[PDB]
Amino acid sequence: TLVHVASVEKGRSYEDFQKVYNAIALKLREDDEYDNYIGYGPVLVRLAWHISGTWDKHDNTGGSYGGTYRFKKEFNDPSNAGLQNGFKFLEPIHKEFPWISSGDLFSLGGVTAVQEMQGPKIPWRCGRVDTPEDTTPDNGRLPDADKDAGYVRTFFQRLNMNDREVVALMGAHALGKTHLKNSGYEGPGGAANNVFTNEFYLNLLNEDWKLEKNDANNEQWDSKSGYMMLPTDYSLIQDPKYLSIVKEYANDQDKFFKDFSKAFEKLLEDGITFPKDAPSPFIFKTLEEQGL
Numbered sequence: 198t199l200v201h202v203a204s205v206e207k208g209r210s211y212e213d214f215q216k217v218y219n220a221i222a223l224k225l226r227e228d229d230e231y232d233n234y235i236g237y238g239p240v241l242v243r244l245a246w247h248i249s250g251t252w253d254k255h256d257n258t259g260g261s262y263g264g265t266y267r268f269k270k271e272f273n274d275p276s277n278a279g280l281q282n283g284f285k286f287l288e289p290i291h292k293e294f295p296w297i298s299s300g301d302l303f304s305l306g307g308v309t310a311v312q313e314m315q316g317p318k319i320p321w322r323c324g325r326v327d328t329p330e331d332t333t334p335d336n337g338r339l340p341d342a343d344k345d346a347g348y349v350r351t352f353f354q355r356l357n358m359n360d361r362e363v364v365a366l367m368g369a370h371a372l373g374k375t376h377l378k379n380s381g382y383e384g385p386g387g388a389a390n391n392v393f394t395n396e397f398y399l400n401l402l403n404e405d406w407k408l409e410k411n412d413a414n415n416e417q418w419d420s421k422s423g424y425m426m427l428p429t430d431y432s433l434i435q436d437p438k439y440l441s442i443v444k445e446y447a448n449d450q451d452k453f454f455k456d457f458s459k460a461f462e463k464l465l466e467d468g469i470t471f472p473k474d475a476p477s478p479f480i481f482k483t484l485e486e487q488g489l
């Protein structure tokens with residue numbers, strides 16, 4: 198019912214946002230030690246997802262538009278524990294480019310992270326506008342990890358995502374790790390990765406998974422190679438419809454990249470009305486492509 202119309206930051210164009218992208222990317226390169234040398238890429242992807250994943254298609258509450266993660270109710274959501282690291286990373290970027298909206302910054306952080314981690318290009322649109330503290334969605338809109346495929350499927354209908362979009366998005370769980378103090382899940386340690394590939398799907402299909410209890414007394418799936426999956430991750434191979442799609446992405450890197458790009462852009466744009474004369478989506482060059 199609420200309408201959020203994208204409004205381009207005054208006078209700004211592609212080159213302005215490429216500069217912001219570049220600053221994020223240069224800081225990703227510089228701050229390499231974070232989380233035992235994983236770096237900030239994975240947490241920035243999770244931040245972009247969590248600021249977007251509060252959306253409810255029924256009333257257009259939540260979503261990335263309003264930048265409401267900057268308000269304490271949302272930044273203190275138990276579901277967001279650990280994301281303060283990503284926010285702190287983005288603070289000096291926002292100070293350098295104070296003209297960018299909070300939603301644009303948080304979402305751009307995720308795009309930049311995916312691309313700099315050698316993921317697909319993610320087209321990105323500007324024009325999110327900060328909204329007041331009373332527009333902050335209540336806690337409890339982000340998903341639980343201890344549930345089954347039916348829970349996941351129903352959960353993602355609220356975000357207008359179908360089976361293929363859900364399975365594609367979940368491939369982000371190749372990135373980074375779980376931290377017991379944040380979520381009650383732990384790992385991987387030495388098997389953690391900061392390069393974007395389709396390995397989530399290959400690992401689901403090819404590892405010898407054991408259902409174990411962690412030190413927080415929660416169940417998770419662990420392999421002898423040191424990989425781990427949440428119950429919701431493992432549900433993608435328990436449900437026959439999800440399983441077919443897992444097999445598809447395990448066997449086609451390009452298809453996975455293309456589907457993830459579309460689903461991730463969609464996620465980041467849910468709730469936003471783009472005027473018919475809005476700029477086209479921007480596709481930012483990586484530092485590597487720029488020789489930087």
Ligand code: HEM
Pocket residue numbers: 239240242243246278279340341342343349366367369370372373374375376377379380381382427429461
């Ligand atoms: C059923 C849906 C999902 C559930 C239950 C879930 C749950 C979790 C949990 C519990 C963690 C660990 C947090 C921590 O301990 O630091 C995590 C991490 C992560 N999630 Fe998800 N997630 C879901 C979907 C997604 C989606 C759609 C994306 C993005 C496309 C995403 C991206 C990430 C990333 C990149 C990390 C690693 C963060 C880091 O290394 O600091 N997740 N997720």
Ligand SMILES: Cc1ccc(N)c[n+]1C
Pocket residue numbers: 369370371372373374375384385425426427430
């Ligand atoms: C939920 C999650 C996040 C990161 C990684 N690497 C694995 N999993 C299962």
